[PDB]
Design a protein around this nucleic acid. Structure first.
Lengths: 25, 130, 214, 76, 86, 197, 116, 93, 142
RNA sequence: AAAAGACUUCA
RNA sequence: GGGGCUCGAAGACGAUCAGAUACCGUCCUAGUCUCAACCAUAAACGAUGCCGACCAGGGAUCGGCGGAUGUUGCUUAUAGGACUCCGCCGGCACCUUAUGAGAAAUCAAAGUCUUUGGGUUCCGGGGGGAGUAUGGUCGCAAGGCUGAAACUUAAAGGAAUUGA
RNA sequence: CGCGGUAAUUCCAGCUCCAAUAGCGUAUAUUUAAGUUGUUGCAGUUAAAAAGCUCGUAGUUGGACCUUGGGCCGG
C-alpha cells in the first residue's frame, strides 16, 4: 500500500528534479 | 491437516469450561492419543461411537476432571506429520520434568517415553503431556 | 498493643490457629497485618526500590513516591507491598503492612529424582505482569540463583536456592519488573503433578468450628 | 508425597476444588467451601457432610451454579 | 446445566438432530423418506420420494400428485398420503 | 444433576397444600423468549411467548436448599438481603421466624468487604430476592468468600450465584412465598416447629 | 442563596428530635429552651438556627415518616403491620388452576388439581 | 482510534453505499453515515394556526405539512442539531 | 501468521533469514561493506598527518569549543576530524606530525555533540597522549 | 460564526 | 469518435488578506457521460492472508428447507405465498459476558504461541536518507513496478493515564 | 544518557576509597546478550509488517478400509 503526504510531495519532485538538470534553471 | 493437535487444543480449553466432554470426529493417529491417555489414566474409559456405516469415525470422551483436580494439566501439540524434526533415544528434549511423559511414535508403534527409551529406539514427538 | 478486630483476627491471635497453613487452606482474606505477625514474628523486611512519581495538579505539583518492600521469611513466604504517598517514609510503612497481608506460600519441589529436601520448584512456572515473561526453569543443585541482583532477593524470601531464570519484555521498567517475579512463585499451585493430584477429604472451615467463641 | 530417603515431604497440601477443576490457591480468597449435611428425619445430622469448594474463577465465568448442581447429589 | 453433550447422549431429541447437518449426525440417515401417495383414480397407491424434484404424476391416472419446491414436495389440492416404504 | 439421599424430615416432602401456595403465589411464571442454557425446567413451550416452570423440579431444589442452611450450628449467622419492596416484606418476616439477621433496603458497599469498617459481616449463607438488582452485593460476597443463594428468574443471573431456584422475581406474592416455605423447612429440622402445616 | 442547612445542622437536628420527642413540640419558642438544656452553643444565632430547623422537621414527622428520623412511636406502628402474615395474600381458593406444563408434573406426583 | 465494535463507522460488508449530498454544503456522504432527521412540521406556527383557520373556508382543512429529511456532513449537525456528545455507554444506542 | 513447519519447506525459512540480518548493525557492516566506506580499512588504529587545528563548537545546549584537529590518513585521501582530549593537547598535537587515531567506541559515526568528529586521538608524536598531559613523559625534540 | 499570524538557549 | 445538460483543477474576476494565488463569491476549459482503446494505482480497508478443527450464552434480520387440522388468504377447497412460531444449514453482523489473548484500548477472535512446533504463503526485522538514487523492467504519456547506499542520529512510534 | 554558564560526589590536581592484581586499559573483527534472525525459538487490529482481488503451477502439504486384531502357556 501507499502511505502519506511524504510520498505525495516526493512523487511530484521525483521526475521534476530529474528534468531540472536538463532545464537547469 | 492431520487432526491430532485439534484434539489436544480442544481438550485443554474444554477443561477450563468444566465440560464433561466435547465429542468430535477422530482419525487414526488420533485413535492413538486416546488409548495412551487410558494407560496413563487421564481417561478411565473411552468409547468410539459410530465407526460403522457413517461417513467418518468419531468418539465421545468421558474424561477425568469433574472430580477435584484436573488430571490433564496441559496437553499441547509438538508438531504433526509431514515435517522433519526428529529425536533419538539419547537426543531427548522433554517438557514437564518427569511428572508427565513425551508422546512418541516409535518404530513398533506408539508407546510412552520410558518404554521407547529402555528399548533404545528413537522416533518423532507428537505432543507434550505435562 | 495487639487487640483483634474482626472475627478473622479473633481466630488467629487467641491461639485457635497454630499455623498459617490453615489460613491458606480456608482462603481467609487477610487485611489486618497483625494477624500474620502473631503466628509468624520471624518476618524480615527489605525495602527493594523507591522510584519517583510526579503529577502536575490543579493547584501545584503533587509528587508521590512508589515504595517496594518485600516481607517474608526465607521458607516459602514472599509478600509484596506497593504504596503511593506524597512522603517517602509513609509509603514504606504502608508497604510493610501490605506485604504481610499478601503473603502466599510457594511450592518448593524437585525435578526428576525426589532428591533430599525441596530446594527448587516442582514444575516450570511462569508469571506475567505487563509484557514481561519471567520463567522458572529447571536447574541442577548448587547452580545458585542465576539472576540479576533484584530477582535474587525475591527468590531468597521464597527459599529457592537453585533455578535458572530468564526474562524478556522490558527489563528496564523497574516498577513492573519486581511485580513480574512475584507472580511465578504464587502460580506454583497452578501446575498439575500426580503428587498433588491426590484427593483430600476437605478440612472444615473455622467459621463453623468456632461459631460460639466468635 | 515421599522422598528418596523415607520421609513424607512437601508440607501444605492445598485445597483443590470440586465443581471447578483446578487448584484452589491462597491468592484466591474469593473461593468458598460449601458443606451440605447428610440428614435424617427431623435432623441436621451434623458430623456427616458432602463437602465441595467453588473457585473465584468459576464465580466470574458464570458456570458456578451449573457445575455445583451436577455434584450436589448426596451419594453418587 | 453444565451440558456439552447430553445426559443421555445416545438418545438426543429430534430437534437436536435437526441442528447438526445430515453428515454430522450421531446416527446418520436420510431425514428424507419414501411415502405412498393415494389417488382415487388409480386402484393402487404409488410410492414416491419426498423431495419430488420432477412434477410426478400418478401412473395410471393423469391426476398429478405433487408439484416440486425447494425442500420436501408441496402437494397439490386434495390428495392424501401415508408415510411408509419397505 | 438432581439430588437424592438422606431421609425426609416431615414437611420437607411434597404436599398438595405446599404446591398450592407456590402456584397461587405465581412463582412458576417464567419470563418470555429469553431463557438460559441452565434451564431444563421448561417442558413444552407454552402459548403467548412465555414459559411456565416445572414446579416438581423446583421442589427438589427447595428441599435440598434447606439442608444447606441448617448445617451451621448457630442460626443467626445467615443474613438475608433485599433492596426491593416486594422482597423486603419477605426478608423481615423471614428474619423473625428464623435466627437470621435482616438487612432491609439499600445494601451499602463495604458491608461484606472492608473488614476494618464497623459494618463488617462474615455470613455463612446469603439469600437474595433478585441477584439482578442486587448484583453489586453479589460481587462483594464473591470476593468475601460468602456463598450467595438467590431466588432467580431466568433473565436474572443464575450465573455466578450458586444454588439457583427458578422463581418469579418480577414481584407479586411469589418472593414472599419462597422465603415463607424456606423458613418452614429449615425450622423443620431441630427447630421450634410443630407437625402439620 | 444564603439560607441552606449545613452538615453540622443536619446531624444535630435529627439527633435532638429522636431522643427528646415527647418534650419536643411544633412550637419554636419552647424548643429554644430545649437546646439550652441539651447543649451549649456559644452564640445566639446558632441556637435560633437549630430551633427553627427542628420545628419544621417536627411538622413533617407528624404528617408522614421522615427519611433519616425514626421515633419510638413511628417504629411501633411499622412493627404492628409486620406482625400479620397469612400465606402472604395468595389464596386462589382450594386447589390451584394451572395452565399446562406443571399439569404433566402434578399428574405424575399424585396431585389432583383444578385446571383452567 | 478503535474504541468501537462498529469498525470504522457504518461499514458492514459494503464499504461504500451510494452517495447523498448534504443540504448544507453538498459534500458527498454515504446514506448510513449521512445523518437524517425527520422534520415533519406545520407550515403555520403555534400562534399562526388560529389566524388562518378563522379567515379560511372549511373547518381547519387538514393543514398540509412539510416533510423533509435533512442531510448533514456530520460537522453541520454538531453546530445545532443532534450530535452534542454523549456519555460512553449510551453511544451504543 | 505462524512459520511453516514442513519437510521441504525448510528452504523458505533459510532464504528469508539472511535478509533480516542486514537490519542488524553488526552483520550490515560486513555485508554492505560499510567498514570500507568508513575511513578505516578495518584496522585497529590508523595513522594520519595533521592538516590543521580546528576549533569545533559544541552542539545544542552545550556551549564550549571542543578543540579538534583534522588529519588526512596516510592510506587514503580521506580527510576527517579527530578530537584531542585533555587539558592542553592542542599544543602537544601540532601540524604535520604523525598522529595515531582510534574510534570513540561509537563504531564509526560522528560522536554527536561534536559534529562530524568520527575519531579521537590515542597518541601524538609516538609518545602517548596520556603521558603528555599528565606530565609523566615529555615529547621528544623533532 | 471567519478578524486571529508570529514568538531565542540551558529548559 | 459520439456527446458536452450539469458541474467544474488551471485561468480570470469580488471580498477577506501586509501576501491569499485559497476557504468564501462569480465566470469556466480539460473533464464529468458513453463506446472501442490505453492504464494498474487508492484509507482498492476489516489498516485484521487463505484454508480446517475446536473453545460461550442470547435475540434480531437476509436466504432456503422442515414441522402447525395457527392467523391472513379464499386460492373451487387446498397447497402456496405475506405474517406469527419453533427447529435448522449457510450469512451480514449485533448484543452481553470472555473462559483466554493483549502493552492497553479492545477482541468469540487480535482465542486455542511460553499450554511456545495444524497446513500453506506473503511481508517486516530502529528512526531518517528513501521509497529516492541507480539498474532492470513496463507504460501511449503521467509515471508505475522492482528497489539501495553513502551519511546522519537516540529514539521514531503505539495505547492508556495525568496536567495545561 | 549526559555534565562544565564560579560552594561540579561527572572536569583538573592532591587525599582517601574502590576494585582486578604480574597484570590491566584501548581499538577492530567476531560470539553471547539478541527469540536483532526466531530449527530449538518471533511479530504483522492499533507499534516496523498481508500482496487490490481471484485463478493457479513449480513447490510444499493431504482422509479413512488397508494379514490386522485377539487368545494360551513358559520364564
Amino acid at each position: 500500500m501507499r502511505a502519506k503526504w511524504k510520498k505525495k510531495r516526493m512523487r511530484r519532485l521525483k521526475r521534476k528534479r530529474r528534468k531540472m538538470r536538463q532545464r537547469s534553471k | 491437516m492431520v487432526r491430532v493437535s485439534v484434539l489436544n487444543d480442544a481438550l485443554k480449553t474444554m477443561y477450563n469450561a468444566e465440560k464433561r466432554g466435547k465429542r468430535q470426529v477422530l482419525i487414526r493417529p488420533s485413535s492413538k492419543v486416546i488409548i495412551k491417555f487410558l494407560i496413563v489414566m487421564q481417561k478411565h474409559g473411552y468409547i468410539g461411537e459410530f465407526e460403522f456405516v457413517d461417513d467418518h469415525r468419531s468418539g465421545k470422551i468421558v474424561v477425568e476432571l469433574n472430580g477435584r483436580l484436573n488430571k490433564c494439566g496441559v496437553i499441547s501439540p509438538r508438531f504433526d506429520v509431514g515435517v522433519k524434526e526428529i529425536e533419538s533415544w539419547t537426543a531427548r528434549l522433554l517438557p514437564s520434568r518427569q511428572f508427565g511423559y513425551i508422546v512418541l511414535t516409535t518404530s513398533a508403534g506408539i508407546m510412552d517415553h520410558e518404554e521407547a527409551r529402555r528399548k533404545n529406539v528413537g522416533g518423532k514427538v507428537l505432543g507434550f503431556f505435562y | 498493643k495487639w487487640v483483634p478486630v474482626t472475627k478473622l483476627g479473633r481466630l488467629v491471635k487467641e491461639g485457635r490457629f497454630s499455623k498459617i497453613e490453615e489460613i491458606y487452606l480456608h482462603s481467609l482474606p487477610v487485611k489486618e497485618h497483625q494477624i500474620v505477625e502473631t503466628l509468624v514474628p520471624g518476618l524480615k523486611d527489605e525495602v527493594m526500590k523507591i522510584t519517583p512519581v510526579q503529577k502536575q495538579t490543579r493547584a501545584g505539583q503533587r509528587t508521590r513516591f512508589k515504595a517496594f518492600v518485600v516481607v517474608g521469611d526465607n521458607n516459602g513466604h514472599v509478600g509484596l507491598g506497593v504504596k503511593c504517598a506524597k512522603e517517602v517514609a509513609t509509603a514504606i510503612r504502608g508497604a510493610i503492612i501490605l506485604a504481610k497481608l499478601s503473603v502466599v506460600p510457594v511450592r518448593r519441589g524437585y525435578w526428576g529424582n525426589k532428591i533430599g529436601q525441596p530446594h527448587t520448584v516442582p514444575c516450570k512456572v511462569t508469571g506475567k505482569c505487563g509484557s514481561v515473561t519471567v520463567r522458572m526453569v529447571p536447574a541442577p543443585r548448587g547452580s545458585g540463583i542465576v539472576a540479576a541482583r533484584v530477582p535474587k532477593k525475591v527468590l531468597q524470601f521464597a527459599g529457592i536456592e537453585d533455578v535458572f531464570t530468564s526474562s524478556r519484555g522490558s527489563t528496564k521498567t523497574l516498577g513492573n519488573f519486581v511485580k513480574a517475579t512475584f507472580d511465578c512463585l504464587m502460580k506454583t499451585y497452578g501446575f498439575l503433578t500426580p503428587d498433588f493430584w491426590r484427593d483430600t477429604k476437605f478440612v472444615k472451615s473455622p467459621f463453623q468450628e468456632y461459631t460460639d467463641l466468635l | 508425597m515421599q522422598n528418596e530417603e523415607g520421609q513424607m515431604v512437601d508440607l501444605y497440601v492445598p485445597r483443590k476444588c470440586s465443581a471447578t477443576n483446578r487448584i484452589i490457591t491462597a491468592k484466591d480468597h474469593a473461593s468458598v467451601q460449601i458443606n451440605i449435611g447428610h440428614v435424617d428425619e427431623n435432623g441436621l445430622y451434623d458430623g456427616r457432610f458432602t463437602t465441595f469448594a467453588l473457585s473465584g474463577f468459576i464465580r466470574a465465568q458464570g458456570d458456578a451454579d451449573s457445575a455445583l448442581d451436577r455434584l450436589w447429589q448426596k451419594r453418587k | 446445566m453444565v451440558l456439552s453433550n447430553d445426559i443421555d447422549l445416545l438418545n438426543p431429541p429430534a430437534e437436536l438432530e435437526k441442528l447438526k447437518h445430515k453428515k454430522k449426525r450421531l446416527v446418520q440417515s436420510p431425514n428424507s423418506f419414501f411415502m405412498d401417495v393415494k389417488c382415487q383414480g388409480c386402484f393402487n397407491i404409488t410410492t414416491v420420494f419426498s423431495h419430488s424434484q420432477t412434477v410426478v404424476v400418478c401412473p395410471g391416472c393423469q391426476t398429478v400428485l405433487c408439484q416440486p419446491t425447494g425442500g420436501k414436495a408441496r402437494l397439490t389440492e386434495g390428495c392424501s398420503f401415508r408415510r411408509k416404504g419397505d | 444433576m438432581a439430588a437424592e439421599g438422606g431421609a425426609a424430615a416431615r414437611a420437607l416432602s411434597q404436599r398438595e397444600q405446599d404446591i398450592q401456595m407456590m402456584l397461587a403465589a405465581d412463582v412458576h411464571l417464567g419470563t418470555k423468549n429469553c431463557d438460559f442454557q441452565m434451564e431444563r425446567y421448561v417442558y413444552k413451550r407454552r402459548t403467548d411467548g412465555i414459559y411456565i416452570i416445572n414446579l416438581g423440579k423446583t421442589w427438589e431444589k427447595l428441599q435440598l436448599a434447606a439442608r444447606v442452611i441448617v448445617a451451621i450450628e448457630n442460626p443467626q449467622d445467615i443474613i438475608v438481603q433485599s433492596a426491593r419492596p416486594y422482597g423486603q416484606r419477605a426478608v423481615l418476616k423471614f428474619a423473625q421466624y428464623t435466627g437470621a439477621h435482616a438487612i432491609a433496603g439499600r445494601h451499602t458497599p463495604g458491608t461484606f468487604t472492608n473488614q476494618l469498617q464497623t459494618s463488617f459481616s462474615e455470613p455463612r449463607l446469603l439469600i437474595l430476592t433478585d441477584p439482578r438488582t442486587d448484583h453489586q452485593p453479589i460481587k462483594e460476597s464473591a470476593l468475601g468468600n460468602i456463598p450467595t443463594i438467590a431466588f432467580c428468574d431466568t433473565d436474572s443471573p443464575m450465573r455466578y450465584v450458586d444454588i439457583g431456584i427458578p422463581a418469579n422475581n418480577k414481584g407479586k406474592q411469589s418472593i414472599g412465598c419462597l422465603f415463607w416455605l424456606l423458613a418452614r423447612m429449615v425450622l423443620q429440622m431441630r427447630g421450634t416447629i410443630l407437625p402439620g402445616h | 442563596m444564603g439560607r441552606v442547612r449545613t452538615k453540622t445542622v443536619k446531624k444535630t437536628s435529627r439527633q435532638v428530635i429522636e431522643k427528646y420527642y415527647s418534650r419536643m413540640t411544633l412550637d419554636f419558642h419552647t424548643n429554644k429552651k430545649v437546646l439550652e438544656e441539651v447543649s451549649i452553643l456559644p452564640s445566639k444565632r446558632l441556637r435560633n438556627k437549630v430551633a427553627g430547623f427542628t420545628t419544621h422537621l417536627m411538622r413533617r414527622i407528624q404528617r408522614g415518616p421522615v427519611r433519616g428520623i425514626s421515633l419510638k412511636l413511628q417504629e411501633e406502628e411499622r412493627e404492628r403491620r409486620m406482625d400479620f402474615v397469612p400465606e402472604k395474600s395468595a389464596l386462589e381458593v382450594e386447589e390451584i388452576r394451572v395452565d399446562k406444563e406443571t399439569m404433566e408434573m402434578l399428574a405424575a406426583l399424585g396431585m389432583a388439581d383444578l385446571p383452567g | 482510534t478503535f474504541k468501537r465494535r462498529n469498525g470504522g463507522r457504518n461499514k458492514h460488508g459494503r464499504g461504500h453505499v451510494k452517495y447523498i449530498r448534504c443540504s448544507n454544503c453538498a459534500k458527498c456522504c454515504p446514506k448510513d453515515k449521512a445523518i437524517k432527521r425527520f422534520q415533519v412540521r406545520n407550515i403555520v406556527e403555534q400562534a399562526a394556526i388560529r389566524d388562518v383557520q378563522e379567515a379560511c373556508v372549511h373547518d381547519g382543512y387538514v393543514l398540509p405539512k412539510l416533510y423533509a429529511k435533512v442531510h448533514h456532513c456530520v460537522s453541520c449537525a454538531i453546530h445545532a442539531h443532534i450530535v452534542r456528545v454523549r456519555s460512553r455507554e449510551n453511544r451504543r444506542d | 501468521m505462524g512459520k511453516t513447519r514442513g519437510m521441504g519447506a525448510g528452504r523458505k525459512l533459510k532464504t528469508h533469514r539472511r535478509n533480516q540480518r542486514w537490519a542488524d548493525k553488526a552483520y550490515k557492516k560486513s555485508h554492505l561493506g560499510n567498514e570500507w566506506k568508513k575511513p578505516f580499512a578495518g584496522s585497529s588504529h590508523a595513522k594520519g598527518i595533521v592538516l590543521e587545528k580546528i576549533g569545533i563548537e559544541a552542539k545544542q545546549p552545550n556551549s564550549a569549543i571542543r578543540k579538534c584537529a583534522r588529519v588526512q590518513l596516510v592510506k587514503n585521501g580521506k580527510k576527517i576530524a579527530a578530537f584531542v582530549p585533555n587539558d592542553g593537547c592542542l599544543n602537544f598535537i601540532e601540524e604535520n606530525d604523525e598522529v595515531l587515531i582510534a574510534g570513540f567506541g561509537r563504531k564509526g559515526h560522528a560522536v554527536g555533540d561534536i559534529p562530524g568528529v568520527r575519531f579521537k586521538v590515542v597518541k601524538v608524536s609516538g609518545v602517548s597522549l596520556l603521558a603528555l598531559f599528565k606530565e609523566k613523559k615529555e615529547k621528544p625534540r623533532s
